[PDB]
DNA sequence: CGGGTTTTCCT
């Protein structure tokens, strides 16, 4: 497994949107329980969802696999995925549906030797005989830090208006700054292995010549979520992004750092990940830190510069 | 015994669900009595439940009994807790129904000498001659702390969509964040015991062979509840989890410590424990508590740091 | 691709204009976090939009097509993008509506045909069938670099007063003066290509033949933007623009050069653009500076003088 | 302006 933490400083921002009112564009928002020296608080602050960061993350997945000869869906090429949900995307990609119980496992293979992201991904198809698949990455909400008692987030709205000569054009859009954080995981070890229970189907073989290529491309696939390739209404509100913090985990157990809220999260995670490897009986832990804000680290840690590097030993290894 | 209270911090989270309504997915609510300065109020607050506590304890130690070369049911073996509850199961892992009254002891040692799930999470066989082994781990609903006179927990719903190129693809989350308390009981001193009453059975060595082994096995099941690994819809809605004050008591007696919802609940614990040890007759009272946001606690008592040494005191002592 | 950040040092400006109270002329405030030796903390400072920038952009882009004998749309030509967004654009260019998904093709290729600015700056026609193209070149807010633990921005306001020979006058303006950073991307590689999915259809033959005149025009456009050709009021507030640090960067595969906001993100970007060719597994990466505050740069970087020179580079290549 | 929840279980 790889589990990460990362934190991101993003200014006059607008990633996520939700329902409008009158003429003006909102801006996500969520209920956040807060810890103060008084006590408790609820507060309402800017979110991002998650599921613009795995459609970013399966487009450059798409991206890498078509580059380098992996198979890809005839839906999934053009950058919509709906997968194997309907009946009416097996009809076009061309696979038939599956009969009975006993019957998964070779739907199951068909479909995940045909397109990478339905192998990755997880997909769900419903029927008589429904078969699930559940993803390999897992994703959440983008938080600001509940560091303190002041959150470090603020939300306004901005005008703006539509020139024209004869007049017979006016709107609103929310703009946040925040100081967001996130964590990430991702189990290598399952890539390229059916999940079903059942006997053996010819075809296995292909999976198991092409699990390596197959998890080296989703590995690389983590480049764009790490550098800011995500969020819509680029065009004109092109963010200004910036990494601050970040810790990668690389482990053969079950394992999960510290979330990026409290200015000391990276000697904690390190201190558990080696007595969690101690009292689990595992056998690799390593562990991986990118610090630019100058908080305390630790003993025996690796330091890197960038993210390229990071990507490159993650795929040596 | 072994009995805990421990206290969590969730934000931006749907771990249970219920039945949904339209094209919006429910998230789990039950009401609740609070008692302010103007009397006795109801009020309607999210939870989770204790089923999906005790499915993430049982896949936990599934894995380490595996992992250990404790004997592990066929069925079980797939995360399947159906247990021996049907004869469809016992027809498929192989095991004689009991005849009479008189046979029931020799069934319960023949399921109890194949899969650990049923020695430690109870069981039941309903038929002629019924069979009956209640759980030796207890849990409960995860509740907010009922402190002072606000509930410092909040549900709202969030929009959805999925983009298509031919449009003929929108949906609804609930998303809850509150400040989770609950508590645990396990009795360690009745693993690999044998509960019908009846004479002695030939195959009782090997369980009091392998009874030390069964029980370190599930003293470290606990390290998955401890740390935060239940719940369903991780893989877009990963929440964000921090321990905030736990205590563990370790008894001869029965016993149950203060529910998390006073600030107060370390003190009052350990003045209860110490009188209930003399007034009971006990002979063994231990006590161990992890706090991370400065409440009182009082004097002579261990205070650890992680939940890795506290399994590794548990287990060693 | 073409990406690019530029550093400018503007005194005593008024470019960007929101709704006034009273007799007072407001500039356009937004909020920044910002991090200090103390922490992180949120200011309010001007800033400047970027469809101010895309109006200026588009408007050089209408001027240059015209002048080489590009098409260029009838309601285009009058500075007033609309675009084909409503039906009387499209009833005064003569366009019919698409029928159905089939014919979304047919009349994407038929706008993209007349008007250039359709093409490089996408459009969207909302109905039955709607239609979209998202914008080939984007662009964001202008915010003074956040740099050390003092904002380098200041606003405030100026009175004056019209003269009458019979009083019956008084107005106020609100004048800024920054250190502004802003970034932008271009890629080439998709203008004069269809967006839609589908079947070739006749007039593709026209955009081929024409690509290499629209891309060079394209590119010929930054100009504007990158000499200062922008913003309102400039007839009585002509502002002071002098460029400090520019940094263009040319590939063949998504990149992102750091913000103009550390004083050392010359050297870092050319280190992440090497290490990044080696991972993406690209063909080509190009990088330029102009560098005129004596910071540091690096090694093996082409240095040049003025943006006309940059220019040319960027057509010839 | 198009699009508004899909199955498989109900002791």
Request: glycine content about 8%; hydrophobic content about 40%; cysteine-free.
């Given at each position: 497994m790889?589990?990460?933490?990362?934190?991101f400083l993003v200014?006059?921002?607008?990633?996520?949107?939700?329902e409008?009112?009158?003429?003006?564009?909102?801006?996500?928002?969520?209920?956040?329980?807060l810890k103060?020296?008084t006590g408790?608080?609820?507060?309402?602050?800017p979110?991002?969802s998650?599921e613009?960061?795995?459609?970013?993350?399966?487009?450059?997945?798409?991206?890498?696999?078509?580059?380098?000869?992996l198979?890809?869906?005839?839906?999934?090429?053009?950058?919509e995925?709906?997968k194997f949900?309907?009946?009416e995307?097996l009809?076009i990609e061309?696979?038939?549906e599956?009969?009975?119980?006993?019957d998964?496992?070779?739907?199951?293979?068909?479909v995940?030797?045909?397109?990478?992201?339905?192998?990755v991904?997880?997909f769900?198809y419903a029927?008589?005989?429904?078969?699930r698949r559940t993803?390999?990455?897992?994703?959440?909400?983008?938080?600001?830090?509940?560091?303190?008692?002041?959150?470090?987030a603020?939300?306004?709205?901005?005008?703006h208006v539509?020139f024209?000569?004869?007049p017979?054009?006016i709107?609103?859009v929310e703009?946040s700054?925040?100081?967001?954080?996130?964590?990430?995981?991702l189990?290598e070890?399952?890539?390229?292995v059916?999940?079903?229970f059942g006997e053996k189907?010819?075809g296995?073989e292909?999976?198991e010549?092409?699990?390596?290529?197959?998890v080296?491309?989703?590995?690389?696939?983590?480049?764009?979520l790490?550098?800011?390739?995500?969020g819509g209404?680029?065009?004109?509100?092109?963010?200004?992004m910036?990494l601050?913090?970040?810790?990668?985990?690389?482990?053969?157990?079950?394992?999960?750092?510290?979330p990026?809220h409290?200015?000391?999260?990276?000697?904690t995670?390190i201190?558990?990940?080696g007595?969690?490897?101690?009292?689990?009986?595992?056998n690799?832990?390593?562990?991986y830190?990118?610090?630019?804000?100058?908080?305390?680290?630790?003993?025996?840690?690796?330091?890197?510069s960038?993210?390229?590097?990071?990507?490159?030993?993650?795929e040596?290894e």
């Amino acid at each position: 497994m790889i589990s990460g933490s990362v934190r991101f400083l993003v200014n006059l921002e607008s990633l996520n949107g939700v329902e409008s009112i009158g003429n003006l564009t909102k801006h996500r928002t969520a209920p956040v329980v807060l810890k103060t020296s008084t006590g408790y608080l609820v507060r309402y602050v800017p979110v991002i969802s998650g599921e613009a960061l795995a459609h970013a993350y399966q487009a450059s997945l798409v991206d890498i696999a078509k580059k380098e000869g992996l198979p890809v869906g005839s839906l999934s090429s053009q950058y919509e995925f709906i997968k194997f949900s309907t009946d009416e995307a097996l009809k076009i990609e061309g696979i038939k549906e599956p009969k009975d119980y006993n019957d998964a496992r070779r739907f199951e293979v068909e479909v995940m030797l045909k397109d990478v992201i339905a192998d990755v991904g997880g997909f769900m198809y419903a029927g008589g005989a429904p078969v699930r698949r559940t993803s390999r990455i897992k994703l959440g909400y983008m938080i600001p830090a509940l560091r303190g008692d002041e959150i470090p987030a603020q939300l306004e709205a901005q005008f703006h208006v539509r020139f024209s000569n004869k007049p017979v054009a006016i709107f609103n859009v929310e703009v946040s700054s925040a100081l967001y954080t996130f964590s990430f995981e991702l189990d290598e070890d399952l890539i390229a292995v059916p999940s079903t229970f059942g006997e053996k189907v010819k075809g296995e073989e292909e999976l198991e010549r092409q699990k390596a290529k197959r998890v080296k491309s989703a590995i690389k696939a983590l480049y764009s979520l790490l550098s800011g390739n995500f969020g819509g209404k680029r065009s004109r509100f092109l963010p200004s992004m910036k990494l601050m913090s970040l810790v990668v985990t690389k482990t053969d157990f079950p394992f999960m750092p510290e979330p990026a809220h409290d200015d000391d999260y990276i000697k904690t995670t390190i201190m558990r990940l080696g007595k969690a490897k101690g009292v689990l009986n595992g056998n690799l832990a390593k562990a991986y830190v990118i610090n630019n804000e100058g908080i305390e680290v630790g003993e025996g840690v690796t330091v890197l510069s960038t993210v390229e590097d990071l990507v490159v030993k993650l795929e040596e290894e």
